[PDB]
Structure formats: structure tokens, C-alpha cells
mmCIF file of C-alpha atoms in Angstrom:
data_model
loop_
_atom_site.group_PDB
_atom_site.id
_atom_site.type_symbol
_atom_site.label_atom_id
_atom_site.label_comp_id
_atom_site.label_asym_id
_atom_site.label_seq_id
_atom_site.Cartn_x
_atom_site.Cartn_y
_atom_site.Cartn_z
ATOM 1 C CA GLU A 671 105.762 130.314 99.977
ATOM 2 C CA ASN A 672 108.918 131.805 98.335
ATOM 3 C CA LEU A 673 110.407 132.596 101.758
ATOM 4 C CA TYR A 674 113.801 134.158 102.244
ATOM 5 C CA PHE A 675 115.765 135.078 105.333
ATOM 6 C CA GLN A 676 117.715 138.360 105.417
ATOM 7 C CA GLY A 677 121.081 137.472 106.870
ATOM 8 C CA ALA A 678 123.662 139.548 108.777
ATOM 9 C CA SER A 679 125.143 140.678 105.428
ATOM 10 C CA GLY A 680 121.729 141.882 104.182
ATOM 11 C CA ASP A 681 121.956 139.050 101.585
ATOM 12 C CA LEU A 682 118.791 136.826 101.255
ATOM 13 C CA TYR A 683 118.972 133.098 102.036
ATOM 14 C CA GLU A 684 116.384 130.758 100.657
ATOM 15 C CA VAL A 685 114.189 128.968 103.187
ATOM 16 C CA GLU A 686 113.061 125.406 102.283
ATOM 17 C CA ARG A 687 110.292 125.511 104.873
ATOM 18 C CA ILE A 688 109.164 126.592 108.298
ATOM 19 C CA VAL A 689 109.431 123.614 110.621
ATOM 20 C CA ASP A 690 107.915 125.119 113.775
ATOM 21 C CA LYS A 691 107.080 128.399 115.527
ATOM 22 C CA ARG A 692 107.496 129.609 119.102
ATOM 23 C CA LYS A 693 107.246 132.711 121.206
ATOM 24 C CA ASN A 694 110.617 133.431 122.689
ATOM 25 C CA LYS A 695 111.413 134.520 126.209
ATOM 26 C CA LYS A 696 111.675 138.121 125.072
ATOM 27 C CA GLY A 697 108.063 137.816 123.797
ATOM 28 C CA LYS A 698 108.908 137.810 120.112
ATOM 29 C CA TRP A 699 108.071 135.153 117.505
ATOM 30 C CA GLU A 700 110.687 132.889 116.055
ATOM 31 C CA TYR A 701 110.553 130.226 113.369
ATOM 32 C CA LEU A 702 112.512 127.050 113.108
ATOM 33 C CA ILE A 703 113.922 127.199 109.612
ATOM 34 C CA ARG A 704 114.810 124.404 107.261
ATOM 35 C CA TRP A 705 117.508 125.926 105.067
ATOM 36 C CA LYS A 706 117.546 125.174 101.322
ATOM 37 C CA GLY A 707 120.214 122.580 100.658
ATOM 38 C CA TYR A 708 120.491 121.526 104.290
ATOM 39 C CA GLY A 709 118.991 118.854 106.560
ATOM 40 C CA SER A 710 117.255 118.959 109.907
ATOM 41 C CA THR A 711 120.606 119.063 111.766
ATOM 42 C CA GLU A 712 121.105 122.633 110.513
ATOM 43 C CA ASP A 713 117.584 123.867 111.418
ATOM 44 C CA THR A 714 117.750 127.082 113.456
ATOM 45 C CA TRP A 715 115.323 129.332 115.328
ATOM 46 C CA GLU A 716 115.181 132.739 113.672
ATOM 47 C CA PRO A 717 113.378 136.009 114.397
ATOM 48 C CA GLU A 718 110.249 136.684 112.356
ATOM 49 C CA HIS A 719 111.296 140.213 111.487
ATOM 50 C CA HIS A 720 114.050 138.827 109.256
ATOM 51 C CA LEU A 721 111.889 136.326 107.377
ATOM 52 C CA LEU A 722 110.653 137.684 104.013
ATOM 53 C CA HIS A 723 108.076 136.593 101.507
ATOM 54 C CA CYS A 724 109.109 137.554 97.966
ATOM 55 C CA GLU A 725 106.430 137.818 95.271
ATOM 56 C CA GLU A 726 106.610 138.889 91.636
ATOM 57 C CA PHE A 727 106.624 142.709 91.492
ATOM 58 C CA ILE A 728 103.327 144.382 90.609
ATOM 59 C CA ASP A 729 103.564 147.908 89.321
ATOM 60 C CA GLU A 730 101.317 150.508 90.997
ATOM 61 C CA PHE A 731 100.305 151.593 87.496
ATOM 62 C CA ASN A 732 99.834 148.068 86.024
ATOM 63 C CA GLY A 733 96.975 147.082 83.700
ATOM 64 C CA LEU A 734 93.672 148.694 82.786
ATOM 65 C CA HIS A 735 92.086 150.029 86.020
ATOM 66 C CA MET A 736 93.760 151.849 88.909
ATOM 67 C CA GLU K 340 94.849 119.168 108.346
ATOM 68 C CA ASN K 341 93.542 116.354 110.638
ATOM 69 C CA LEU K 342 94.656 113.703 108.130
ATOM 70 C CA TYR K 343 94.258 109.999 108.698
ATOM 71 C CA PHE K 344 95.220 106.986 106.639
ATOM 72 C CA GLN K 345 92.821 104.025 106.397
ATOM 73 C CA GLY K 346 94.976 100.967 106.885
ATOM 74 C CA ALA K 347 94.556 97.345 105.739
ATOM 75 C CA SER K 348 92.458 96.656 108.871
ATOM 76 C CA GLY K 349 90.106 99.574 108.089
ATOM 77 C CA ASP K 350 91.516 101.236 111.262
ATOM 78 C CA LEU K 351 92.612 104.939 110.864
ATOM 79 C CA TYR K 352 96.250 105.937 111.427
ATOM 80 C CA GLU K 353 97.125 109.502 112.203
ATOM 81 C CA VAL K 354 99.289 111.315 109.662
ATOM 82 C CA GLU K 355 101.763 113.914 111.039
ATOM 83 C CA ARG K 356 102.168 115.499 107.617
ATOM 84 C CA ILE K 357 102.444 115.027 103.893
ATOM 85 C CA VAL K 358 106.108 115.194 102.952
ATOM 86 C CA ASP K 359 105.811 114.987 99.161
ATOM 87 C CA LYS K 360 103.510 113.949 96.306
ATOM 88 C CA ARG K 361 104.082 112.032 93.078
ATOM 89 C CA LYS K 362 102.219 110.441 90.230
ATOM 90 C CA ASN K 363 102.980 106.766 90.201
ATOM 91 C CA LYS K 364 103.720 104.580 87.222
ATOM 92 C CA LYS K 365 100.140 103.351 87.191
ATOM 93 C CA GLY K 366 99.051 107.016 86.813
ATOM 94 C CA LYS K 367 97.660 107.413 90.305
ATOM 95 C CA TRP K 368 98.675 109.943 92.976
ATOM 96 C CA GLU K 369 100.615 108.949 96.028
ATOM 97 C CA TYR K 370 101.758 110.890 99.069
ATOM 98 C CA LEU K 371 104.862 110.447 101.111
ATOM 99 C CA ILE K 372 103.541 110.234 104.639
ATOM 100 C CA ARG K 373 105.173 111.228 107.875
ATOM 101 C CA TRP K 374 103.500 108.973 110.430
ATOM 102 C CA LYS K 375 102.555 110.374 113.856
ATOM 103 C CA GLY K 376 105.134 109.216 116.366
ATOM 104 C CA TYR K 377 107.680 108.251 113.727
ATOM 105 C CA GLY K 378 110.659 109.866 111.977
ATOM 106 C CA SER K 379 111.620 110.315 108.358
ATOM 107 C CA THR K 380 113.077 106.773 108.190
ATOM 108 C CA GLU K 381 109.527 105.385 108.370
ATOM 109 C CA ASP K 382 108.050 107.724 105.707
ATOM 110 C CA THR K 383 106.153 105.747 103.060
ATOM 111 C CA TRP K 384 104.448 106.451 99.734
ATOM 112 C CA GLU K 385 100.724 105.809 100.031
ATOM 113 C CA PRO K 386 97.773 105.937 97.633
ATOM 114 C CA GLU K 387 95.606 109.049 97.811
ATOM 115 C CA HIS K 388 92.379 107.078 97.914
ATOM 116 C CA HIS K 389 93.246 105.875 101.418
ATOM 117 C CA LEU K 390 94.143 109.280 102.852
ATOM 118 C CA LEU K 391 91.231 110.887 104.757
ATOM 119 C CA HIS K 392 90.532 114.321 106.111
ATOM 120 C CA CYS K 393 88.398 114.146 109.265
ATOM 121 C CA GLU K 394 86.409 117.221 110.318
ATOM 122 C CA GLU K 395 83.949 117.780 113.150
ATOM 123 C CA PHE K 396 80.549 116.381 112.104
ATOM 124 C CA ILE K 397 77.969 118.908 110.919
ATOM 125 C CA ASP K 398 74.384 117.776 111.030
ATOM 126 C CA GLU K 399 72.329 118.253 107.841
ATOM 127 C CA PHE K 400 69.648 119.808 110.042
ATOM 128 C CA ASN K 401 71.992 121.994 112.173
ATOM 129 C CA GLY K 402 71.215 125.579 113.219
ATOM 130 C CA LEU K 403 68.675 128.145 112.077
ATOM 131 C CA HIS K 404 68.545 128.036 108.239
ATOM 132 C CA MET K 405 68.570 125.002 105.948
#
């Protein structure tokens, strides 16, 4: 899904996959993240607001029709 | 995906998930299967022709229109 996590530095960290999902005790969604280059021992629960999906850029004024 | 593997007995075995996919040396597709109730140590490469998707049955003559 070309998923990236925005870390404390603002730098993006590549996500291998989402392992699981839960609602936390504050009522907010978290995902259990498999980090690229790591195994299940390093999987961590992360807030959804920091998980990004990056797609190729598409220019507002791209192509034939607007 | 409600996936099931049809085993040597003809009995269906529940698949937790598909871990990976490859074309084998005979030219046929295989999937690396995570078996329900098992861990990655028991993952095995299985032929696609034995992997089933089971959905609720829908009767040819169900509902209002044909």
C-alpha cells in the first residue's frame, strides 16, 4: 500500500505491513506495524494519524480534461 | 478472505493468511500459507489449485429478479 510512518523527527519510515488494528483506551485507532527490515519482535502499536499512504503525485492541471 | 485449503483427505483446512506467492519450477503458482493456529515455522508452499475461497451460498433463484 506504499505506507510510511512519520516519526518524531518528521522523517518517514517505511512500513512493511499492518499486522493488526485496535481502538486504544483513549478511543483512538492504532495499528500494529511491521517495520521494513525488521521482524515481528520489533512490531509496535502506532497512532493512525501518523501513518501515511504515499502515491505518485498527480498535478491538478494534468492531462487533457480538467 | 475466508480461505481454505483442500487437503489430501479432501477435508478443508482453514488458512490464516497468504504470506507470499511464487511461480514454481513447473510453471505453476504456489502460495506460502500461514495455517490457522500455527506460527511462521509451519508456513508451507502450496499449489493454487487446492486453495479455496468459501462464500455464503447464494441460490440461483434467490430474491426478486432473476
